[PDB]
Amino acid sequence: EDPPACGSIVPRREWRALASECRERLTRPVRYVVVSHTAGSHCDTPASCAQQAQNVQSYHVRNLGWCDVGYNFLIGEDGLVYEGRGWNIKGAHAGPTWNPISIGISFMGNYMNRVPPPRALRAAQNLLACGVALGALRSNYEVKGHRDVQPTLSPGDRLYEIIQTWSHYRA
Amino acid sequence: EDPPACGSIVPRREWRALASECRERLTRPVRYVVVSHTAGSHCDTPASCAQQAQNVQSYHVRNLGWCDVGYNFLIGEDGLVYEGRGWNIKGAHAGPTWNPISIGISFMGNYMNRVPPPRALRAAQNLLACGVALGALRSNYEVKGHRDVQPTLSPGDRLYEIIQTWSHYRA
Amino acid sequence: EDPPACGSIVPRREWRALASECRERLTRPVRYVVVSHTAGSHCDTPASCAQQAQNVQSYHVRNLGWCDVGYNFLIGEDGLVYEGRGWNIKGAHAGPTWNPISIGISFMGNYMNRVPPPRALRAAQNLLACGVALGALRSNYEVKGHRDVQPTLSPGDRLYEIIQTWSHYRA
Amino acid sequence: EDPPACGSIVPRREWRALASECRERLTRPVRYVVVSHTAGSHCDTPASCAQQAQNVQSYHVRNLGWCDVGYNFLIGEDGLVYEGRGWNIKGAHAGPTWNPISIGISFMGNYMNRVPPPRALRAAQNLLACGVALGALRSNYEVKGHRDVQPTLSPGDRLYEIIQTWSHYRA
Numbered sequence: 293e294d295p296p297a298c299g300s301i302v303p304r305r306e307w308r309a310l311a312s313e314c315r316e317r318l319t320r321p322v323r324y325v326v327v328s329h330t331a332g333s334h335c336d337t338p339a340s341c342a343q344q345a346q347n348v349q350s351y352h353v354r355n356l357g358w359c360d361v362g363y364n365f366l367i368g369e370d371g372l373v374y375e376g377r378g379w380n381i382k383g384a385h386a387g388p389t390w391n392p393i394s395i396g397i398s399f400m401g402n403y404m405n406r407v408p409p410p411r412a413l414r415a416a417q418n419l420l421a422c423g424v425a426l427g428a429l430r431s432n433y434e435v436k437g438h439r440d441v442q443p444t445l446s447p448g449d450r451l452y453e454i455i456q457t458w459s460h461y462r463a
Numbered sequence: 464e465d466p467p468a469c470g471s472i473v474p475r476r477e478w479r480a481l482a483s484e485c486r487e488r489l490t491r492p493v494r495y496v497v498v499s500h501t502a503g504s505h506c507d508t509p510a511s512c513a514q515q516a517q518n519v520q521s522y523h524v525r526n527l528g529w530c531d532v533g534y535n536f537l538i539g540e541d542g543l544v545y546e547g548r549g550w551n552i553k554g555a556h557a558g559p560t561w562n563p564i565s566i567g568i569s570f571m572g573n574y575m576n577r578v579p580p581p582r583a584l585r586a587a588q589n590l591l592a593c594g595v596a597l598g599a600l601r602s603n604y605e606v607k608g609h610r611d612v613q614p615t616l617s618p619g620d621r622l623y624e625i626i627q628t629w630s631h632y633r634a
Numbered sequence: 635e636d637p638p639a640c641g642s643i644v645p646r647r648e649w650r651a652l653a654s655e656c657r658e659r660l661t662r663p664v665r666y667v668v669v670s671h672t673a674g675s676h677c678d679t680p681a682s683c684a685q686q687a688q689n690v691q692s693y694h695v696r697n698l699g700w701c702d703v704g705y706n707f708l709i710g711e712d713g714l715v716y717e718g719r720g721w722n723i724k725g726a727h728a729g730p731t732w733n734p735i736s737i738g739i740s741f742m743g744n745y746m747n748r749v750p751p752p753r754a755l756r757a758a759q760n761l762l763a764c765g766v767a768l769g770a771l772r773s774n775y776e777v778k779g780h781r782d783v784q785p786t787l788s789p790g791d792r793l794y795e796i797i798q799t800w801s802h803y804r805a
Numbered sequence: 806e807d808p809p810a811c812g813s814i815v816p817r818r819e820w821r822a823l824a825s826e827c828r829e830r831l832t833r834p835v836r837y838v839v840v841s842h843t844a845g846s847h848c849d850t851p852a853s854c855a856q857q858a859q860n861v862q863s864y865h866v867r868n869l870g871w872c873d874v875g876y877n878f879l880i881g882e883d884g885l886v887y888e889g890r891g892w893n894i895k896g897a898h899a900g901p902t903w904n905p906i907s908i909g910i911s912f913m914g915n916y917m918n919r920v921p922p923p924r925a926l927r928a929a930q931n932l933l934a935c936g937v938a939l940g941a942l943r944s945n946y947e948v949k950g951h952r953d954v955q956p957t958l959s960p961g962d963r964l965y966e967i968i969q970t971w972s973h974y975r976a
C-alpha cells in the first residue's frame with residue numbers, strides 16, 4: 293500500500309547484533325526524536341561501521357548490563373543507517389521522561405569539534421522521513437538535542453548547531 | 464573522640480542557589496557513589512567556583528526544568544565542596560536505576576586530559592569520610608564512575624583513572 | 635563460586651511434590667521476574683501451605699498435563715518460599731514470549747482484595763535477593779506484574795499495588 | 806529492610822515485643838555462635854510462635870528484670886527466625902565469659918526427647934549466612950553448643966546431636 297519507500301537501513305542481522313532482551317514497546321505515532329552522539333570513534337566504511345555498531349552495543353549490554361544497545365538507530369559517516377531497537381521497542385537514551393515518548397537516533401562519533409559528512413546528515417534526515425511514511429513518527433515530529441533534555445555535551449558542539457537549524461527542531 | 468567531625472561544605476546560601484523544589488527522599492545509609500564531571504569549565508577561587516555552581520544549577524533547573532541542580536554535591540578545584548541537593552534528597556545523575564540508591568558528586572570542569580589538583584581530590588574524599596561519619600553513606604560503600612553506569616565519557620579518562628585507585632571503587 | 639548468602643526455601647521432597655518431568659533450561663542469568671497469584675485458597679501454617687503447594691502442582695500436572703507446576707517458586711502466607719521448578723528450569727506462567735526469559739514466583743491465594751502478610755512479602759524479596767547472590771538473577775533484574783505481560787488481573791489489584799513500590803519494578 | 810540477603814527475619818514490631826533497654830554494644834565481628842533451647846513450650850505456626858516469643862521476653866523483662874529478651878535471635882518450628890537483641894546489642898545467654906564475644910540463637914522448645922523440624926534447622930543456618938553477609942559474624946565463625954560453654958542440659962540431647970553435624974561446629 294503506497295510502498296513507504298524509505299528502507300535503506302542495515303538490519304541487526306547484517307551488522308551482527310547480539311540478540312535483544314528488551315521487550316517494552318513504544319506507542320506509535322511517536323512525537324519526539326532526540327539526537328545524540330556516541331562520543332566514541334567515528335567510522336567511514338560499511339565495514340568499519342559494522343564493527344563500531346557492534347562495539348557501542350557491546351559497551352551497552354556487557355558493561356552496563358542493558359537489554360540491548362540503548363538507541364533506536366545509529367547513523368554512520370558511511371552514509372548508512374543502522375538498526376538498533378527500531379521503530380517499536382522503547383530505547384534507553386534520555387531518561388524516564390523522554391524514553392517512553394521518543395525515538396533516539398545517534399551519530400557514531402565525537403562531534404564536539406567536527407561536522408558529520410553530508411551523506412551522514414542525509415541518511416539522518418532521510419531516516420526521519422521514513423519515520424513519517426511508516427507512521428512511526430508524527431507527520432509533525434519534534435527534533436531535540438540530547439543536551440536539551442540531559443546534562444550532557446551530546447550531540448557535540450558543531451552537530452548541535454546543525455540540528456537547531458532543522459525545521460522540526462523545537463527549543 | 465568520635466562526633467560528626469565532618470568536612471566543610473559550602474552551604475547553598477553562600478553560593479546563592481535558587482530554591483530547591485525537590486521532594487524525593489533517599490533512604491540512608493546509602494551504598495553507592497557515582498563520580499561525575501560537569502564537562503564544563505573549571506574554577507580556582509571560592510569566588511569563581513560559587514559562580515560555576517550557579518551556571519550548572521540554572522542550566523539544570525530552567526533549561527531542563529528540574530527541581531534543583533542534579534548533583535548532591537559539587538567539588539571545586541578551589542578545594543571546597545559545594546552543596547548540591549545534599550545527603551537526603553534523591554538526585555538526578557545516573558538514570559532511574561542508580562539515582563535512588565546512590566549519591567552524586569561532580570567535579571566542576573572537564574577532565575579528559577586534565578587531572579584535578581590534590582585539593583579537589585582531598586575535598587572529595589573528606590566528603591565521603593564525612594558521609595560515613597554521619598550515617599549518610601554505608602560504611603562499606605562503593606564508588607563507581609559515571610561511565611560505569613551509563614553511556615558517557617564522564618568523569619573524564621584521567622579522573623576515572625584516579626577513582627579506580629580508591630578503595631570503595633568496585634566493578 | 636559466588637554465593638554471598640541465600641535464603642531458606644522448602645524443598646520439593648518436603649512438600650511432597652511429584653517428580654518433575656521438565657527438561658528445558660532457562661539461560662542464565664535471568665533479567666525478568668513476573669509476580670502473579672494462584673487465585674486459589676490461602677494458608678498460614680507450614681502444614682497447610684505444603685498441602686496447598688501440592689494442589690496447585692497437581693492441577694497443573696494431572697489436569698493441564700504440564701511437566702510440572704507452572705511457577706518457579708511458590709510463596710506462602712506462612713512466610714516460607716516453596717520450591718517449584720526452581721532457578722534452572724523454564725516454567726509455563728505468562729505466555730511464550732515471556733516464559734523463556736523470566737522467573738515466575740506466585741503468591742498462594744487470590745489477592746484481589748486481601749493483602750499478603752508482611753512475612754510473605756519478605757519471603758519473596760529475600761528470594762529475589764538470593765537469586766542475585768546465586769547469580770541466577772542479574773543485579774539488574776526487573777520485577778513485572780503478570781498483568782503487565784498478558785491480559786489478566788493475576789497479581790491481584792492490591793498485591794499489584796504493593797509490588798509497584800518495590801525497588802526493581804518496571805513499567 | 807535489615808541490609809542485603811537476610812533470610813527473612815521477623816521484626817520486634819511484628820511479634821509485639823516490648824521496648825529493649827539494653828545499651829551494651831557487641832564488638833563486631835563476632836566469632837562464636839551459641840546454640841541453646843528455651844526449654845519452654847514449642848510452636849509450629851507463626852501465630853503461635855509470636856505469642857511464644859512474647860512469653861520468653863516478658864519472663865526475662867518483667868520477672869527476671871533484664872533489659873530485654875536474653876537471646877539475639879529465637880527460632881520457631883514454624884520455620885521463622887525471630888528478632889530479639891539482634892546483631893548489635895550484646896546478649897544474655899551464656900554467662901560473662903561468653904556473652905560479650907558470641908551471638909546467641911535459641912530454639913523455642915525443649916529438645917531432649919524431641920527433634921526440631923528441618924525448616925527450623927534450615928532457618929538457623931540461613932540466619933548465620935546473613936550474619937556473614939552483614940559483617941556481624943566472621944566468615945570463619947565457630948558454633949558451640951550451650952553445654953560446651955556452661956554446665957547446662959540445653960540445647961537438649963536431640964538438638965545437640967544435630968549441631969555436631971554442622972560444619973562450623975568446633976570442639
Ligand SMILES: OC[C@H]1O[C@H](O[C@H]2O[C@H](CO)[C@@H](O)[C@H](O)[C@H]2O)[C@H](O)[C@@H](O)[C@@H]1O
Pocket residue numbers: 670671672673674780784785786787788
Ligand atoms: O484472576 C487471577 C488469575 O488471572 C489469570 O487467570 C485468569 O485469567 C486468565 C487469562 O489471563 C484465564 O485464562 C484464567 O482462566 C483466569 O482464571 C492468571 O493466569 C492466573 O494465574 C491468576 O490466578
Ligand SMILES: OC[C@H]1O[C@H](O[C@H]2O[C@H](CO)[C@@H](O)[C@H](O)[C@H]2O)[C@H](O)[C@@H](O)[C@@H]1O
Pocket residue numbers: 841842843844956957958959960961
Ligand atoms: O536442659 C536444658 C536447660 O539446661 C539448663 O537448665 C536446666 O539445668 C539447670 C541447671 O544447669 C536447671 O537449673 C534448670 O531448671 C534445668 O531446666 C540451662 O540453664 C537451660 O538454659 C537449658 O535450657
